[PDB]
Design a binder for this molecule. Sequence first.
Ligand SMILES: *[C@@H]1O[C@H](CO)[C@@H](O[C@@H]2O[C@H](CO)[C@@H](O[C@@H]3O[C@H](CO)[C@@H](O)[C@H](O)[C@@H]3O)[C@H](O)[C@H]2NC(C)=O)[C@H](O)[C@H]1NC(C)=O
Ligand SMILES: *[C@@H]1O[C@H](CO)[C@@H](O[C@@H]2O[C@H](CO)[C@@H](O[C@@H]3O[C@H](CO)[C@@H](O)[C@H](O)[C@@H]3O)[C@H](O)[C@H]2NC(C)=O)[C@H](O)[C@H]1NC(C)=O
Ligand SMILES: *[C@@H]1O[C@H](CO)[C@@H](O[C@@H]2O[C@H](CO)[C@@H](O[C@@H]3O[C@H](CO)[C@@H](O)[C@H](O)[C@@H]3O)[C@H](O)[C@H]2NC(C)=O)[C@H](O)[C@H]1NC(C)=O
Ligand SMILES: *[C@@H]1O[C@H](CO)[C@@H](O[C@@H]2O[C@H](CO)[C@@H](O)[C@H](O)[C@H]2NC(C)=O)[C@H](O)[C@H]1NC(C)=O
Ligand SMILES: *[C@@H]1O[C@H](CO)[C@@H](O[C@@H]2O[C@H](CO)[C@@H](O)[C@H](O)[C@H]2NC(C)=O)[C@H](O)[C@H]1NC(C)=O
Ligand SMILES: *[C@@H]1O[C@H](CO)[C@@H](O[C@@H]2O[C@H](CO)[C@@H](O)[C@H](O)[C@H]2NC(C)=O)[C@H](O)[C@H]1NC(C)=O
Ligand SMILES: *[C@@H]1O[C@H](CO)[C@@H](O)[C@H](O)[C@H]1NC(C)=O
Ligand SMILES: *[C@@H]1O[C@H](CO)[C@@H](O)[C@H](O)[C@H]1NC(C)=O
Ligand SMILES: *[C@@H]1O[C@H](CO)[C@@H](O)[C@H](O)[C@H]1NC(C)=O
Lengths: 322, 322, 322, 170, 170, 170, 39, 39, 39
Amino acid sequence: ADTICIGYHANNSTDTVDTVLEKNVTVTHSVNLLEDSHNGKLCRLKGIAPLQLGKCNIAGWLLGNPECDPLLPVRSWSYIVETPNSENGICYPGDFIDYEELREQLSSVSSFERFEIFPKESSWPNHNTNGVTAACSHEGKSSFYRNLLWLTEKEGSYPKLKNSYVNKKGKEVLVLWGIHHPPNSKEQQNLYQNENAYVSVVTSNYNRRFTPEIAERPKVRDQAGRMNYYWTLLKPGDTIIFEANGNLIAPMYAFALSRGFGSGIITSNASMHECNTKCQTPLGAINSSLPYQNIHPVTIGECPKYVRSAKLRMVTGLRNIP
Amino acid sequence: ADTICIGYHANNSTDTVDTVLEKNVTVTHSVNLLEDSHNGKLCRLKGIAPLQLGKCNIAGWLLGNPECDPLLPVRSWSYIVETPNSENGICYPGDFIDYEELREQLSSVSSFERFEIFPKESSWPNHNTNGVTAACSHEGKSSFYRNLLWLTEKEGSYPKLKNSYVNKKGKEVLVLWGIHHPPNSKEQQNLYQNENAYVSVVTSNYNRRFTPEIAERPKVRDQAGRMNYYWTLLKPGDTIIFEANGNLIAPMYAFALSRGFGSGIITSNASMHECNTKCQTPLGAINSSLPYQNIHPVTIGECPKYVRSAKLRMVTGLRNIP
Amino acid sequence: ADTICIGYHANNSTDTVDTVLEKNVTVTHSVNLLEDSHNGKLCRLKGIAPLQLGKCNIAGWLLGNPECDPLLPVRSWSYIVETPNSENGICYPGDFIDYEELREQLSSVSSFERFEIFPKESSWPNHNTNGVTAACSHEGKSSFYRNLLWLTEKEGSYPKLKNSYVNKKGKEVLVLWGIHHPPNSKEQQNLYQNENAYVSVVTSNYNRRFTPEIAERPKVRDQAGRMNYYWTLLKPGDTIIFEANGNLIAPMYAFALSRGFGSGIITSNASMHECNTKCQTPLGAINSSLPYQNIHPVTIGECPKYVRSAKLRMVTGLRNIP
Amino acid sequence: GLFGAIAGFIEGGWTGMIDGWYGYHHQNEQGSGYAADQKSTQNAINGITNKVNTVIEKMNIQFTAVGKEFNKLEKRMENLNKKVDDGFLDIWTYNAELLVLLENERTLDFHDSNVKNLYEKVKSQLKNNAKEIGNGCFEFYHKCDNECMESVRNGTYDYPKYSEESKLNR
Amino acid sequence: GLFGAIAGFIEGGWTGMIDGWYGYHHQNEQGSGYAADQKSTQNAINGITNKVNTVIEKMNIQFTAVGKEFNKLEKRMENLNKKVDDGFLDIWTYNAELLVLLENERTLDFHDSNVKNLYEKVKSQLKNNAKEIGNGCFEFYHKCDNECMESVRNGTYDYPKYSEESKLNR
Amino acid sequence: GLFGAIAGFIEGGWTGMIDGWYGYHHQNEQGSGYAADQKSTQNAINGITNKVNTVIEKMNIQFTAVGKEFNKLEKRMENLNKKVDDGFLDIWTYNAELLVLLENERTLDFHDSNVKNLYEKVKSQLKNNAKEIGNGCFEFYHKCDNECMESVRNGTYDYPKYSEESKLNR
Amino acid sequence: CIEQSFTTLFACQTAAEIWRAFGYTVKIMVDGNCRLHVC
Amino acid sequence: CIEQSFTTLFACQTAAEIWRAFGYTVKIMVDGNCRLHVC
Amino acid sequence: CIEQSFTTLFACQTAAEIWRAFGYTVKIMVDGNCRLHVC
Ligand SMILES: *[C@@H]1O[C@H](CO)[C@@H](O[C@@H]2O[C@H](CO)[C@@H](O[C@@H]3O[C@H](CO)[C@@H](O)[C@H](O)[C@@H]3O)[C@H](O)[C@H]2NC(C)=O)[C@H](O)[C@H]1NC(C)=O
Ligand SMILES: *[C@@H]1O[C@H](CO)[C@@H](O[C@@H]2O[C@H](CO)[C@@H](O[C@@H]3O[C@H](CO)[C@@H](O)[C@H](O)[C@@H]3O)[C@H](O)[C@H]2NC(C)=O)[C@H](O)[C@H]1NC(C)=O
Ligand SMILES: *[C@@H]1O[C@H](CO)[C@@H](O[C@@H]2O[C@H](CO)[C@@H](O[C@@H]3O[C@H](CO)[C@@H](O)[C@H](O)[C@@H]3O)[C@H](O)[C@H]2NC(C)=O)[C@H](O)[C@H]1NC(C)=O
Ligand SMILES: *[C@@H]1O[C@H](CO)[C@@H](O[C@@H]2O[C@H](CO)[C@@H](O)[C@H](O)[C@H]2NC(C)=O)[C@H](O)[C@H]1NC(C)=O
Ligand SMILES: *[C@@H]1O[C@H](CO)[C@@H](O[C@@H]2O[C@H](CO)[C@@H](O)[C@H](O)[C@H]2NC(C)=O)[C@H](O)[C@H]1NC(C)=O
Ligand SMILES: *[C@@H]1O[C@H](CO)[C@@H](O[C@@H]2O[C@H](CO)[C@@H](O)[C@H](O)[C@H]2NC(C)=O)[C@H](O)[C@H]1NC(C)=O
Ligand SMILES: *[C@@H]1O[C@H](CO)[C@@H](O)[C@H](O)[C@H]1NC(C)=O
Ligand SMILES: *[C@@H]1O[C@H](CO)[C@@H](O)[C@H](O)[C@H]1NC(C)=O
Ligand SMILES: *[C@@H]1O[C@H](CO)[C@@H](O)[C@H](O)[C@H]1NC(C)=O
């Protein structure tokens, strides 16, 4: 006699999923939700290449450490890459004050204009501007930071100075400067004339007076003196004023900042290729529609959500029983 | 032949819900869990009206900026409202140190007693107490903060002073004071006599020595000098001591604080009405038993849980098939 | 006629569980997931006893307050217990700078070697090292911290001193020192000779110059002067240098630190017993395989996850209907 | 749906049954009418309202939450605070929406199950004294007046009582 | 319940069936007794214990967690730390309680389903060699000794073997 | 499974049915073959793909997330930041895994239900014009050519049409 | 008649409206609990 | 023929591959939505 | 006899007590896994 049977699909699938009641159920159809593949490359993001600091770090870059000269013309970037070798930073020893905050600020900068805030020949008429140091050597000559200017006595005198810059860039301007602390009083006298010298820096939302601390520190890069490095953000339309009768390492170049969201600083061992991505990790770029990934918690762009999971597979079909 | 059928309710409901398998299912009964309605008003909370700072900010309020005089008698409040116009703060230019921390402290204060910690006529017997400034003008006359006192030389001298207050209020006492920094040495001499002056302030858990910084700043409100503003909380039973031979802007009124939980500072464009609520947001008050709301993340009182959702509707009845 | 019936188990269980649809369902089998039992004791962790500070706090312990002498030989511990009576800390009044950070550092220390960084008799050849104070009395005699050394003038002079220690321990070395602030100028002169004295402390990642502040504070423990207390971590292979012409309370003993994970500082009223646990809370130790506990959020070791719940019971069997 | 009854072998609902979610329509010599099944309706309202209470109990309130301020050199702390606020908001938005979606699916399935179980309960009382005619309906092989109908509705139908007359008819 | 069997058409449980969650009670000339169904009991214990393991696996431990201290001018940081601690505790308390409530509902429904499927399995073996008498019970139209009973219990009942004698009796 | 059909009373699947998840195998004088049931297959693909979309919609992206730095005297802040990062990661890992486990269980049960409902639908059309022979199969008491078979498959089987010839045969 | 007790006002209000939609009488008693007497 | 609309690319791709595994024809239209025309 | 393997001690203990409640014999082997030999 004739028959009809009701039944369900089976196929050759070997994919498995877990449920709460049962592990490793073989199923006819399923989909992986966890991305574990990346291309092992640093890529452009939305077309724009990252800034590779190489053997330089952020401090070497923004002060203009002469070892970092290849970075000087770069104006825009999609993220910033340091490496475990990013070591060339300050070259004349001292401390960089609020460095972590500066790195945090830079993480939302997408481009800047490097400009001459105090032109070297016209800004400091009665001071020498040519001071260099063997601690910042370049091509076998004593040199100095490309964005700062060492002011010293001229003809035996270091008269009180006052210079100011009005921010007409329509953008925040990042100003860096330094304070020099000689190791002894004759260096103080030789460099700056005035034994009891001061520096002050003033904006509408920043004010600090600096007094040098004369003392012999252990030698670092052959230097017994020290140089501390400072920064502030000058708001649009504000004025910054520098006053000193010694010890000021003056700004020469500053940075008009353009903000963007989604940038950041990462550390990476990967190599730059000519590729483009929507999602970069320090291990490689991700090109995926999957909702989750277990590749890396550090992400630039628009990336799957990081989880610690080893497997996330959703069944769509049914128990496979061929 | 007779019949009986088993069946289910249908009605004229057009409400829909979503499930995981299916969107926009029309159902016979359901309930909205997401509150999206507020009354567009600032209200009292549990009976107590908020403190509306209006054109003043916290600093103008607690220093007693003369523009803020209407605030002087208020003793209790349920929350504090600033507006985008809350601009009258310090009137003699300078910095307010640890201002964010002071705002955070004030967020748990439900009332205070404003009291004369150092009575003007008896506290400073050998100093003038009448100093005013055009930077803090009121009714067309130079004036000064209502809670501080500008001490100056009397008969050509500014003798060393020491005053102390013992906290017998059984509450923390908020003490504010200021440090004046003249623009030049003749002002220093004229106001305070002593060229190398100091101020010290001491409690059991606070101690600071202040030394004036004489220098010409750009003029702000026509002032080249500066005044920095400081605060501390004097614990019950502790003593605060002020010592100076110049430059002290002395406390005159202080605040015995009563703590409560659930207060806060909000910024709002809404208007005060004669209404009462259990839940206030910067957009309006909420009167709801619903568990969630998408109105605002800033809440005073006991409010539904904020979520970004646009719809949360739970079905209670069944698929509606009339 | 013969019969067969299909059915389900029932028993005498009175355990209940809740579901979403129904509360207090009596079920045949179930398991409690929420641990609410602890043994009411402080125990060893993985064999190692905790450090009980007793009437001392961290500051009294690491400075060597003479009241804390029983702690001096302890070298390793599994966690640190303070009590509500842990009050003996600094004995000569002053501030302990970055104390919260020091406590946070100590929370990952599992042992240390207390060693003589500057031997008392050889380190300070032209200074007295025997200064004591009644503020740090012991056994009815003026005494001093066991890990620091009060240097003073010898034969009327306090010559400029410079001492340094090179860290050859292969571990971070915790160095503590103090800065003394006499109440008046004759004490300054009597103790240190030099009226305008300074102290400096220098490592590769620490540098500070201290200048005493001479003034009469209210008396605390009968002292009008003050002593501030400082610390730093000297990295392996680095050198720390002390320079002074007065006012230095010198390091004498320091601590070579061994790091471990999972340690911490707790406050507890419980008593030490001869027991061992994998999980300690301030109320008692937990010995449990359950996934959750509602005993305490503070945990040392490997503990069930803390939740606020009063009951978590999972049914494993079925509705019980005897 | 999972139990095959609602929008399934009973193709539509009844606007005429106004006094509960599940029940009966009868037709005999005396007339026709709708009547909700009171026990399953009442148990289901008890279950569904307990479910609402349970959902609400677990998250329904927040206490005062106000902004914090950070100065120009506290950008890391300000970003940390914002990461915390955004991250908790992400989690609670996810939790709230998914709890409602999942409970909605379960609620519809629960109603489907209750209809299916009421149908099977009647089926097992009538046995072969009635025939299954489609769409959730039974046609009796005997006369079933309102007393007989009520005994079906309250689960006390007496199969032996009508079985001889049913036997003759089918 | 969702499958209509437990607290449903089988109104109560059996304290006399002590060796599993589901099974059989028989009565014939040789006697009467209870016997658990071993396959469905064993599969269900396997499922339920896997479910416990899965729940436990996802959250069962915390490592050292101790308090932090803040000075008098670190109230924002102290409040930020407290917001983090309270917020994580809110989330884990919610997660733990709701996971247990939801899994408890599913567990009871799973048992109900297993009883229902065991009933239907016997029903489909016996066909019209027995009659459904209520409360999960079948009454044979033939003599069914213990060998016959065991064949029902282990799913190898031989309908043609007894069908002539059943036919004569009904 | 919960509905007793898949890996249940229909013991295995069909590699020969390649055009949907559920359907029919027939055998008559004209031949034999497989055919998916198009309506239940299409509704199920619609449901399952909506479920995937819903899961994905609720969590599928993170925006830029980069490390923060802390100096040697910011260890509390550094630990606070790490507590936040680790705690959110714990929660999202738990959420993701448990959502998939729970939805996987529901998906398999959904397929089981669809097979069960298709079986019962055919059963209720054929009534006693066919006999239930085991393993999801019916054997007709009448000749059922391909037009008859298609009417079973599309839910329009005409029981009165074949009932006399069926009656004679059983 | 039927008694229900609710720890949330919302669920109490929700339950009352369903019963009333089917023609039942509902008396509400607020006492942390919200209680329904349904007839 | 059948129309589906998806707010996620992933679900769109997932749906297309299932239909195609059963021999259906699928045209995909990307338009925030991803739409399937299934025949 | 039946073998089970558990990644958590808790679930192992839970499973052993259920089997034993029904009269089965359970031998436990702890080896990260906890294993049950059920007879
Ligand atoms: C369910 O509804 C049925 C039908 O209304 C109820 O059964 C009826 O119960 C009444 C009891 O008052 C019976 O009346 C009695 O009849 C006997 C038998 O002849 C007579 O001797 C008594 O003096 C009395 O009048 C009636 O027979 C009976 N009808 C049927 C069809 O069973 C039943 O009580 C209801 N059960 C529940 C749980 O609501
Ligand atoms: C389920 O239980 C039934 C009933 O105990 C088992 O069936 C019985 O299996 C035995 C096999 O040892 C059969 O004995 C054999 O009988 C034949 C037929 O007359 C005889 O020729 C052989 O030499 C042998 O003695 C017995 O007939 C049979 N009884 C019935 C009622 O089928 C069955 O093995 C069990 N199946 C499982 C999967 O546990
Ligand atoms: C489900 O499949 C069945 C079987 O293929 C379809 O029923 C068939 O429908 C056709 C309509 O073209 C019927 O043909 C008509 O037959 C009548 C009756 O003798 C004749 O007078 C007409 O001129 C016409 O040729 C055919 O009888 C009918 N067969 C059966 C067994 O019912 C049905 O249309 C399909 N339904 C759906 C919803 O797909
Ligand atoms: C991202 O991955 C997709 C594949 O998943 C790439 O799309 C393929 O591109 C190749 C060109 O090399 C085409 O031949 C294929 O037809 C495409 N496949 C699909 C499914 O679209 C895409 O190019 C990748 N994008 C980037 C930026 O790497
Ligand atoms: C909060 O809202 C409820 C309504 O949801 C208000 O209660 C109503 O108050 C009016 C008076 O204007 C009464 O006539 C109604 O009978 C009340 N309805 C209910 C459902 O209780 C309540 O007054 C509101 N409270 C506030 C403070 O605005
Ligand atoms: C932790 O608790 C378990 C019990 O849950 C203890 O194990 C028992 O130890 C006693 C010895 O006093 C034995 O006689 C029992 O047979 C053990 N029972 C089980 C179930 O293992 C264990 O000793 C406890 N551990 C600690 C460190 O307290
Ligand atoms: C499995 O089946 C698919 C679809 O029918 C086919 O394309 C593939 O070649 C098969 N693979 C194996 C290994 O059988
Ligand atoms: C819908 O039904 C409700 C309840 O029967 C009734 O009160 C209302 O007026 C109806 N509305 C419309 C638009 O039919
Ligand atoms: C309940 O039943 C268990 C298992 O049969 C038995 O061991 C126990 O003694 C009983 N307790 C009571 C109070 O009946």
